[PDB]
Amino acid sequence: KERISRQRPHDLQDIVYQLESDRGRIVNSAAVRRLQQKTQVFPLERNAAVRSRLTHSLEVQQTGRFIVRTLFRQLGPRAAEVGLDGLEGALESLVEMACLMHDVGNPPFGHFGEYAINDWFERNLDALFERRVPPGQGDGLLQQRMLTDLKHFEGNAQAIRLVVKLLRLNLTYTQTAGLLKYVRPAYEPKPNHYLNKKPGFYLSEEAFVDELRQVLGMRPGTRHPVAYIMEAADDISYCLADIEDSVEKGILDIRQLADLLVKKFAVHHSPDAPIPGDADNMSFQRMVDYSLEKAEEPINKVSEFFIRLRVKMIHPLVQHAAQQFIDNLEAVHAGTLGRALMEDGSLPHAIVQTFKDVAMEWVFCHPEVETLELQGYRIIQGLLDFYAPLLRLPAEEFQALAEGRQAAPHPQLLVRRLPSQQIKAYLEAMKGVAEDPLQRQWEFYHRCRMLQDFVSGMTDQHAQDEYRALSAL
Amino acid sequence: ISRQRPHDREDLQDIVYQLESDRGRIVNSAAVRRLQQKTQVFPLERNAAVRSRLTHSLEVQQTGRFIVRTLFRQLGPRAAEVGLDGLEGALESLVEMACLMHDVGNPPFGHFGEYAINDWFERNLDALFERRVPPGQGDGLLQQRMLTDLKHFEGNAQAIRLVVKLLRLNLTYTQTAGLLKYVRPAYEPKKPGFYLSEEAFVDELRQVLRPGTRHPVAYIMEAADDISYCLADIEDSVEKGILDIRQLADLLVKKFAVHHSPDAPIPGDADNMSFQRMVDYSLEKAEREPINKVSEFFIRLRVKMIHPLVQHAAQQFIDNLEAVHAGTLGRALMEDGSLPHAIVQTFKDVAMEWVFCHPEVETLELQGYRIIQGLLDFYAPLLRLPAEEFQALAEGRQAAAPHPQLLVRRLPSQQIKAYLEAMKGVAEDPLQRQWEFYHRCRMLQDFVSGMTDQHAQDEYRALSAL
Amino acid sequence: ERISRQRPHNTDLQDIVYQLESDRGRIVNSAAVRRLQQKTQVFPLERNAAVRSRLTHSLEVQQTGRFIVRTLFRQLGPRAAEVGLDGLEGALESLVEMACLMHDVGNPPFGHFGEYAINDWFERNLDALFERRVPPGQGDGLLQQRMLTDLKHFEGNAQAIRLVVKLLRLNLTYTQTAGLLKYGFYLSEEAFVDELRQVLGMRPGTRHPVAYIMEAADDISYCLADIEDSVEKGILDIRQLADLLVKKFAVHHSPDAPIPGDADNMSFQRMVDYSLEKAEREPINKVSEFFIRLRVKMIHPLVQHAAQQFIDNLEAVHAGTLGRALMEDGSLPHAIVQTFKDVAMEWVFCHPEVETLELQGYRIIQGLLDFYAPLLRLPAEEFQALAEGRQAAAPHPQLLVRRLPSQQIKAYLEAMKGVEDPLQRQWEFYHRCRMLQDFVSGMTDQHAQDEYRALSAL
């Protein structure tokens, strides 16, 4: 398990220094800052103390730390045989930072930011690319690969592109490798299913993935040990935070949530069964009954419930995940384990899914959330419609605008609104393929890539604002 | 005048009792409540004490009552010869409730909500319908009957659909018959009395109560609506500052002069007052009144002039009682070229010249056109869905499409369930695809026309995300 | 000379001066001038208080134009009689001043993007709309292709002629109108331009002496005013602008070269240093003093150059055949004019607040045209009824028509009454499109935003 390098795209103690630099580099990065202004479930404009993408990530970060520490206590002396000796901090820092940036890629407005982009390109890309690369001329395999690549947007892939090629953070390949939750390319279609279901990286980062797989020591089409821990971390804190916000927002009552938890639990298992990992041998209904009994703390009745519920129930989940990592140590180190550590049908498995099940019935169906999903759908599409004039330009006109040359006055205004990082990332990519025979295909591919970087990098209010301004209303 | 209700599968006190339930059902219904939030002429958002659809319906309700009172007073003992034995409350209540709901069907924003709907379907229904039932399959006559059906929306027809098939109020067929002001249906080519979807209900109504004729209640309600059609709006104009009391009089006299001579006495006035004598009498009461000159003008003008109009409308009903009882009279009770006809038209003409053309009013009409059409454009993704896919969403099943799913979850439960029930009737029908999309479009017209002004503006604004 | 007193509804000189003085009143009291106060020049008026508007820009150009004319007669002196500009000091002054004041009444709101938005809209959708009115075959093809480029190429100067003459009906002298022929006109004003050239004795395709003077006026105060607004807004500093002015001036000529027309023989670097020195020494209004001291030293040579160029090319100018602007000759004062333009392009017009207003104004004008496009799709019979107020079967367009200004509708009715012509159908749709361009281009900034917002119903 010594697949831990310190090499950047540009003695264990030296690695720890480099991994410490990654910690400061990530926390100070703009990718983390955007997470505070992106809503998680309930829209931030209407809710005061509600979880954001950053505060969600911080919980996952500590939960991720809780797993790694609990993990090594279990391994004890045998960790040295596998190679985990003296990797307590390094694996800690890898898991900790990976959790924090687990969501830097994904766009505003939940998954409907994702849907809006793919839907727009699904509808208008084919006609747009046809004008840029006429049918017949141009390499057909790369074309069909570029077409499906742009049509399949995924946050995890953008997160790699964001840290590597847009924010140019130049983190160690080991730290970046945590973001490879999915391993399939977006050029390859959806089917080995679970670890290749969603796009893992973009075509623009294929060369970087080649360097990452070589430098960090892995096989193509495989994951990384940190990603399993991060996936389990997000699974554990997937909704418990969101459910607490719902109770505070008034959607359900604590007493009603308890029986609601019990009734929704019946699908997975029986509540009267004992829970693994609890010293006091508490059952799920006994834990829920224990949590409700402790509430009614006289200051924070709601807060105490989720606190008492967390101490009792987060411990088995964290303990479960650690045993799963050690049980499949060989499968994980190869990168060939094809399921999430949590997902195995066990009694603690029911914990994670019961939270998922309760949220879908009562939290995400709330009109305030679905109104934001629908509204963000318009904003992303309108933005794409607003900046589509840049896509209709032929490559000579656009590159002049991207370079600052005076062309075409309306598109020039659109170009001047784009972030410099995104224009320059476009310019730098084009400098690389400026002599390629297939430049026309890569130009428009990177043009759309630039336009897709723009919209997903927005915060909620940053996106709505730009939409409103262009609307001139 | 029967007492059968549509959910009734089976004595004047028995008939009068059932009609009393119709009063409670109508007054408490949401159809009435929306009328308070639908503007009549001047937009409610910008005007406080201005008449809305509900306050208009209330005024019309009383005028309709005053006719039945005058009708029985004029006919007197002769009522037995015609057959109006013991019908004081029933005809009073029938006319009263029919007037209250005379305007519930039509969408927000005056007629431009209607125009917006017809214009939207006229423009893009055909291409939308072609995808649903490909060329070849399906009765083409039924299709051509459905196209103009969906393309010809009329408020009165939707009023039939709303109380019967949307609010499920289950009113007596007689009370609903008041809503059949005009005769033509929507498949035959003026405004439709009913839509193709309500033919089965109309079939039961025509039998229980000849096909293609108007019920006696509608003529009184038609006359009721005409009397208070515009006099109310003019008062709002004077209050809005568009007209002055002295200025309005000269307009009333001048516009009346074209139709008849102002100095001619009006039939039905005990003092044999003419239009000029009445208007000079009403204006004289103004400037004599020292607290509320505007109010005094229209009350005096109402008191002197409403009574002859009511007498005339009742007199024409009895004059053509046989033609009315048949239902074959092809004109409104008021319109005959007489002196009171000139009164009604003088109010309408003054209104068209100064009130309905007001920029505040026409902006709202223009704005309501945009709102209704945008709302139809916003929910058109549901129309593009194939018939199988929609049913999953309407049933609450988890369909692949998340964006149409969000659109369906915004729709009222009543309209979705009414759609689901419509498909249950033609479940394994041979031509169900033609009917499925027909009820799909039908549901969307229920949604937009059921909105209030602000409900529409809000939903338009919300989906726009601006 | 080229100066008559005839209005559309050798001579006593005082009669012209009275008539031209009446033209002054007609212009100042006109709505065309009033709209200029509510149309932003560079920085959006909604967000900036003491920023120049089209009216405040035009007022400076008026003074600069006056200073040119005043300086011009001093140079000519007794030789002024030889050319025929004898005793025309007041008349040519007042003529030039008003030409400056209305030099910008034509162009639409939102900078050049109001112009750009209209042409872009007509270039995209004019063809299909016109074809419905004139199917292939029928209609003069020469006139059709000529009407197309006329409608597709909107220009403020052309609209300025049309507005005062055919829309506001000011009935100004042809000489006052002749100043607006900087470039140049619509097909709708060909007959009016022909009478103007005949009345003034102009061969076709030539300029007017006032236009050369006005152009020099606009060139001189083109940008120095906008630059001062930037300093107040914080875009630039006084010290930063000075090094920028000298550095950007270096491309054209050498800064230490002396500037013609300065009694003290000052160079560009010396003038900027003189202006900067008076500032910071001035203790209350450093910004104003900089531009006052700068204007004092630098406007005087510019005006002298334009007057001197006028007499140098008097023969070409009175002919109307001079094919360059008085300012642009590669000289030292020309380098002054370009230095201001150069510095402005780098720091002023490129400002995001400005470009947002342009992008938004591009949106508003295009949306407004889309909103009123239903009027273009109507056939001529429907519209003529709508313009006359008769109750036509159409319900939505009648609301749209009732929103249009009466002057623009009445101007259309009068044009159609003029043309029954065999190609009336060809002229009807051209004048229909023209009225829509009159509507949109006549709006102020906020008037355009408001109508757009209202129709959007949001």
Ligand code: NI
């Ligand atoms: Ni997460």
Ligand code: NI
């Ligand atoms: Ni009515």
Ligand code: NI
């Ligand atoms: Ni200018």
